[PDB]
Amino acid sequence: HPETLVKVKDAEDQLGARVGYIELDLNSGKILESFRPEERFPMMGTFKVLLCGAVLSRVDAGQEQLGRRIHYSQNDLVEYSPVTEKHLTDGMTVRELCSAAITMSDNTAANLLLTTIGGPKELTAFLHNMGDHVTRLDRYYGELNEAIPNDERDTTMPAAMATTLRKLLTGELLTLASRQQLIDWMEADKVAGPLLRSALPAGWFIADKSGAGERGSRGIIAALGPDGKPSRIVVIYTTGSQATMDERNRQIAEIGASLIKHW
């Protein structure tokens, strides 16, 4: 994808930052194109899809129920909890929590779900067990933010994340019901408008999950395709930029426009 690689490298120039990129064929798993596929980037909230994959594996095993109601309190609420902060009294079901975590990127929802699966170490063990020896979740939201240079906590690589997303959405790891639920939550994503969705022509399918973080971090994982059906996985990460979120959004959108134009 020569024109798209030109745009990915341009994004690095414009942002003064690293950009990682991969296109993966959904059906075959082949890498169609990549840039920095095996460099680490902060995952940010894109891990929330993997988290709910782990939750669904427990549901499939009969050890979790999507309808199970979880009660929590004020002290559970962390920064950016637009859905969970409304249900202190009523609580929320596991299904509602995954919807909040994926479609709104609700941070308390992610913490509550992490607790149900045994925490970050158990999520990382789940990933390791399905063949991803790279992606690691280390911290709950709200844990102390001691800046470490080249911090490897809470990171993935574009190729690892793309392969792992493909396995979750199409592999035999999850039941059909759970695969469909996971992609349905991603299709209902509400906070990724200015990224790939802004470049997407009418009639196209997209299921995605955005992320944002300090130090210029911004990213998206997606399954998308024309004619109402996904046929490709796209993963884009950037970190290090001093640019505003608008500028990072725009570079990702422009990569998306190139992706679509040269589909």
Sheet holding 218-225, edge to edge: 31-35, 18-25, 232-239, 218-225, 205-212
Write phi, then psi, for 222 (nearest 5 degrees). Answer: -155, 150
From the centroid of its chain, how far is CA 104?
Answer: 12
Return the structure tokens found at 112.
Answer: 């509550």
CB 35 within 8 Å of CB 17: no
Resolution (angstroms) equals 1.4
Nearest to 71 by CA among 93, 54, 53: 93
Residue 171, classified by CB atoms within 10 Å of its CB into exposed (0-12), middle (13-18) or buried (19+), is middle
Q: What is the spatial distance between Cα 5 and Cα 13, in angstroms, rounded to a whole number?
A: 12
Q: What is the spatial distance between Cα 12 and Cα 236, in angstroms, rounded to a whole number?
A: 12
The one-letter code for the residue type at 87 is H
CB 110 within 8 Å of CB 51: yes
Q: What is the spatial distance between Cα 145 and Cα 191, in angstroms, rounded to a whole number?
A: 24
| Dihedral angle computed from the Cα positions of residues 23, 26, 29 and 35, in that order, rounded to the nearest 10 degrees | 10
Strand partners for 235: 22, 221
| Dihedral angle computed from the Cα positions of residues 41, 84, 92 and 177, in that order, rounded to the nearest 10 degrees | -30
Q: What is the spatial distance between Cα 86 and Cα 190, in angstroms, rounded to a whole number?
A: 17
Q: What is the spatial distance between Cα 49 and Cα 181, in angstroms, rounded to a whole number?
A: 11
Contacts of 17 (CB under 8 A, 6+ apart): 216, 238, 239, 240, 241, 242, 243
Give the other-Cβ count within 10 Å of 75's Cβ: 6
CB 1 within 8 Å of CB 32: yes
Q: What is the spatial distance between Cα 105 and Cα 189, in angstroms, rounded to a whole number?
A: 9
Give the other-Cβ count within 10 Å of 31's Cβ: 15
Strand partners for 24: 31, 233
Three-class secondary structure of residue 3 per DSSP = helix
Q: What is the spatial distance between Cα 163 and Cα 144, in angstroms, rounded to a whole number?
A: 30
Nearest to 259 by CA among 211, 169, 199, 219: 199
Q: What is the spatial distance between Cα 207 and Cα 29, in angstroms, rounded to a whole number?
A: 17
The domain made up of 1-263 is a member of CATH 3.40.50.12780: no
Q: What is the spatial distance between Cα 185 and Cα 207, in angstroms, rounded to a whole number?
A: 8
Three-class secondary structure of residue 251 per DSSP = helix
Q: How far apart are the two ends of the chain, measured CA to CA in Å?
A: 9
Method: X-ray
Give the other-Cβ count within 10 Å of 30's Cβ: 9
Return the structure tokens found at 5.
Answer: 């690689």
Three-class secondary structure of residue 140 per DSSP = coil
Contacts of 221 (CB under 8 A, 6+ apart): 46, 49, 161, 162, 165, 208, 209, 233, 234, 235
